[PDB]
Structure 1
Amino acid sequence: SVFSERTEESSAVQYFQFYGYLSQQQNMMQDYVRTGTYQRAILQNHTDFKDKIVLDVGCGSGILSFFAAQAGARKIYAVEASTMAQHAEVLVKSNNLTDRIVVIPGKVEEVSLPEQVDIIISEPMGYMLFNERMLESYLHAKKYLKPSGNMFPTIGDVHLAPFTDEQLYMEQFTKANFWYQPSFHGVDLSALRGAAVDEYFRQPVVDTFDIRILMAKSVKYTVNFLEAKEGDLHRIEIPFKFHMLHSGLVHGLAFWFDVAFIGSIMTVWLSTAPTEPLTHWYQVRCLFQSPLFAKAGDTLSGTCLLIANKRQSYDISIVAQVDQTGSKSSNLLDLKNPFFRYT
């Protein structure tokens, strides 16, 4: 199957074991902006669901399918690969919707659907949008979509912006300098200091921050789910050229994302920006190995390259330079194992 060939067994096992916990479902269900916005997006666009055939990709407990039912859907095929699929089956029955919702346990790449659908609903977003590589499953599911179909969400916007956070930057060396001592219980640990530093900077930082740390207007990269193919997400190149609004040291790039549900009646947005109420996605920051100095009016240019790996994630390569001075910095990060810093 498409899924198995692009995914290490070991990763998938852990992955779907994670999503088999009800506390996990509960965690996201209790994120009100997420759940409420989805419900709002579906119900306020009822003409996109009334008497329609629906596919729910990765339905979990099946909540989104129930929203599709509330909107008047004729038939909803709810696909889920984790064991949560049982619990969804329980809920459909207990809610007297066995006639409209069909839970189909398995990976969307492997199961079979009896008919084509009018619309696909899903929540494939991970950290920095792309983490978990579910965007690909969502796009893969379009093999079941009628030429007349819609996708909820319809587009996804990733935003990148340079930031200054002197403390976050110095934090890494404060932690790594543990190894910079010539006699830890009689052992000289110093030789590992460099490797320790390396390890810390490879982790993207998951948390939130004050918007005043942002030093330039964000650059946006858009995925149109109606148009994009799976292969388009194996290699994602985000070129950028930031026009610096403030003077100071740029310590790295901040990431967040929005999705839009473009329905027949209205467009509804779900935003994870630092200007909006906090979600379980938070924001993601990737540090530069060396900060770059820039003055207001200077230009910070370069590329963010995301290469997909078989651990259901991406290798992040970021290169940036201040055009006016020629000061250059790089970093390589492993998105699969971020550092949860939020307190």
Structure 2
Amino acid sequence: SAVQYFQFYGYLSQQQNMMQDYVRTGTYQRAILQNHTDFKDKIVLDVGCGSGILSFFAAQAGARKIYAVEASTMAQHAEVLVKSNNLTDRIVVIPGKVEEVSLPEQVDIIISEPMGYMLFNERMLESYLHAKKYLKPSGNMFPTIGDVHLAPFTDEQLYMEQFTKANFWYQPSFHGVDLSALRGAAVDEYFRQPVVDTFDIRILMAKSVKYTVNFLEAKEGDLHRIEIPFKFHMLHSGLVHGLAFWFDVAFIGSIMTVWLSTAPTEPLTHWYQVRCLFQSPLFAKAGDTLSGTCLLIANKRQSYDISIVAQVDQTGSKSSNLLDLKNPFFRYTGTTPSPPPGSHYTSPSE
């Protein structure tokens, strides 16, 4: 539901949680300030301003007028901050959906933070693209482009954990009740959940594949159906338990390009990384090719139905999987991720 989505972002604690992500917030601030010529005396649109922080960064960069659109009740709080920071003549908070509000004029640049898990979750990118109707023909988008990265991984424990949980139902006398008939359904449910957390990069079995969305060119409708083909050339031999997902966005300004990355090679963000499991894992040897497709289909719950089909070309062994991005499993514990066993090529005792 949309109501619930906007209720979630009405809480100051959630805004705070996002603001406290230093990578995110700091990178946005740097991206805006270091490209000051894209903002000085310009007209700006902030799509989904929340607390208003990005608009304040735009004001720090010298913007003449900033329209800050916000659909949740947070809009009232942003208005309080615009007043208390004495920026009433430069920032105008507009309550409502960017799809339904009216803007007084066209803008030189649109800024937003529309990314969700594996980039697309929450389907805010559509609104962000929708807002382009207010952009002048020479206008810019901050972020300008988004890269989704995919890679196959091996993680036997993560895989087996699912069955360990579902096997609760495989008992003939739970307080006298035979639960076993539901074991299959429980297994399916667990494997339909994308897994949100981080991992050691050594579990990755091949160089990532990149899928790019150019926000200046893309159309809203483009995000209702996203087909991501992939061809992985395996670097390590073993069992492929699924695909890991992360993303980067780039702010391409007149002075410099600034990147915000959620890669597992980078410090963690509140986006972590996402893994989609194969219910049937695939064996591959170094040198093999793992080919297939990831298809994201927009649904009515502000999310996507994910279909992943993969095959090892040399053996023809196939795996097909369906996942629901709206019900991810938050697994992150804070514990340092262990590398796969058999990572020692020299004696650990030396």
TM-score in same-fold range (> 0.5)? yes
Partner Cα separation in structure 2 for residue 144 and residue 153 of structure 1: 16
C-alpha displacement of 1:318: 0.2
Partner Cα separation in structure 1 for residue 100 and residue 44 of structure 2: 18
SS in 1 for 2:133: helix
SS in 1 for 2:2: helix
Is residue 250 of structure 1 aligned with residue 234 of structure 2? no
Partner Cα separation in structure 2 for residue 30 and residue 140 of structure 1: 28
Aligned partner of 1:134 in structure 2 is 124
Q: Residue by residue, what CA displacement relative to the aligned partner does 1:133-187 show, whole Å, maximum 9, x if unpaired?
A: 0000000000000001000000000000000000000000000000000000000
Partner Cα separation in structure 2 for residue 306 and residue 249 of structure 1: 24
Partner Cα separation in structure 2 for residue 133 and residue 177 of structure 1: 34
C-alpha displacement of 1:289: 1.1
Partner Cα separation in structure 2 for residue 314 and residue 188 of structure 1: 35
Partner Cα separation in structure 2 for residue 288 and residue 187 of structure 1: 31
Aligned partner of 2:15 in structure 1 is 25
C-alpha displacement of 1:254: 0.2
Partner Cα separation in structure 2 for residue 192 and residue 116 of structure 1: 57
C-alpha displacement of 1:246: 0.1
Q: Residue by residue, what CA displacement relative to the aligned partner does 1:177-202 show, whole Å, maximum 9, x if unpaired?
A: 00000000000000000000000000
C-alpha displacement of 1:111: 0.1
Partner Cα separation in structure 2 for residue 309 and residue 187 of structure 1: 37
Partner Cα separation in structure 2 for residue 154 and residue 336 of structure 1: 26
Partner Cα separation in structure 2 for residue 116 and residue 318 of structure 1: 41
Aligned partner of 1:44 in structure 2 is 34
Aligned partner of 2:299 in structure 1 is 309
SS in 2 for 1:203: coil
Partner Cα separation in structure 1 for residue 171 and residue 272 of structure 2: 35
Aligned partner of 1:90 in structure 2 is 80
C-alpha displacement of 1:332: 0.1
Percent identity of paired positions between Structure 1 and Structure 2: 100
C-alpha displacement of 1:205: 0.2
The gaps in structure 1 that reach 5 residues or longer are 1-10
With normalisation by structure 2, the TM-score equals 0.94
Q: Residue by residue, what CA displacement relative to the aligned partner does 1:272-318 show, whole Å, maximum 9, x if unpaired?
A: 00000000000000000100000000000000000001111000000
Aligned partner of 1:206 in structure 2 is 196
SS in 2 for 1:55: strand
Partner Cα separation in structure 2 for residue 110 and residue 317 of structure 1: 32
Partner Cα separation in structure 2 for residue 31 and residue 236 of structure 1: 28
SS in 2 for 1:132: helix
C-alpha displacement of 1:340: 0.3
SS in 1 for 2:111: strand
Partner Cα separation in structure 1 for residue 111 and residue 213 of structure 2: 16
RMSD of the alignment, in Å? 2.3
Partner Cα separation in structure 2 for residue 304 and residue 50 of structure 1: 41
With normalisation by structure 1, the TM-score equals 0.96
SS in 2 for 1:291: strand
C-alpha displacement of 1:112: 0.1
Q: Residue by residue, what CA displacement relative to the aligned partner does 1:16-47 show, whole Å, maximum 9, x if unpaired?
A: 00000000000010000100000000000000
Q: Residue by residue, what CA displacement relative to the aligned partner does 1:56-107 show, whole Å, maximum 9, x if unpaired?
A: 0000000000000000000000000000000000000000000000000000
